[PDB]
Structure 1
Amino acid sequence: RKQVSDGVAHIHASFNNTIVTITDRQGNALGWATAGGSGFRGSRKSTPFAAQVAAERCADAVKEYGIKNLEVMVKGPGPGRESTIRALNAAGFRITNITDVTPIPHNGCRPPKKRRV
């Protein structure tokens, strides 16, 4: 179906969850997979293992497109992200670019207070 043959893997690692979205070069999503949607709810959805099985599961569900090349775009910090791109070249993809696209303000908005734990 529609046979795009090149895409972008936007991986959005945060501290609590990694969410991998495989799209095309136009930016239209072709299929996604989160670490929290792969079993292991909770303290286990923020691990490199959960991110890699999230990326394995996002490599599935884009078989209908015949993607061979993809760029990787990485957001946020997280226990994910590093393992995530590994799972992508464990799934036959030719990984072309690895950009880190974490949003950094140039002293913009005030961050929240928190955490007197």
Structure 2
Amino acid sequence: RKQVSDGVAHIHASFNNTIVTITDRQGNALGWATAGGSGFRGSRKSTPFAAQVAAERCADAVKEYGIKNLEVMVKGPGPGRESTIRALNAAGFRITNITDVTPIPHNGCRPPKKRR
């Protein structure tokens, strides 16, 4: 239908379900997947092995939109979540630029209290 070539991707490295999105550098979303969309549940879903599957679902659904080059935006504290960008790299898209977009605040809202 449409050709994107040098798209952009967005990942949300939450401790829970990781979000991966493909975007065409204009805000309109091409495709999307979770570690939870395949029926994964519980702590089997938080290991870095789990984030790969969503990356390959995104890649193999977005073939028709024709990604050739790509950008990726990463925010989150989740450890080792760049396994997703390993998966996109291995999927054949030429990943050219990377930025960390973690929403740090300048000490605004008050964070929730901790458990003992």
In structure 1, list runs of 5 or more residues that go unmatched. Answer: none
Aligned-pair distance for 1:114?
2.6
Which residue matches 2:89?
Answer: 89
Aligned-pair distance for 1:105?
0.1
Higher helix share: 2
CA contact (8 A) 1:10 1:21 kept: yes
CA distance in 2, matches of 1:39, 1:24: 28
Deviation string 1:9-61 (CA, Å, 9 cap, x unpaired) is 10111011211001111121100010111232111111111111111111111
Q: Which runs of 4 or more aligned residues in structure 1 lie more than 3 Å from their structure 2 counterparts after TM superposition? A: none
In structure 2, list runs of 5 or more residues that go unmatched. Answer: none
CA RMSD of aligned residues (A): 1.1
CA contact (8 A) 1:52 1:80 kept: no
Normalised TM-score (structure 1): 0.93
Which residue matches 2:42?
Answer: 42
Identity %: 100
Correspondence 1:16 to 2:23: no
Aligned-pair distance for 1:80?
4.7
Secondary structure of 1:80's counterpart equals: coil
Aligned-pair distance for 1:89?
0.7
CA distance in 2, matches of 1:28, 1:47: 30
CA distance in 2, matches of 1:80, 1:59: 20
CA distance in 2, matches of 1:11, 1:80: 12
CA contact (8 A) 1:46 1:80 kept: no
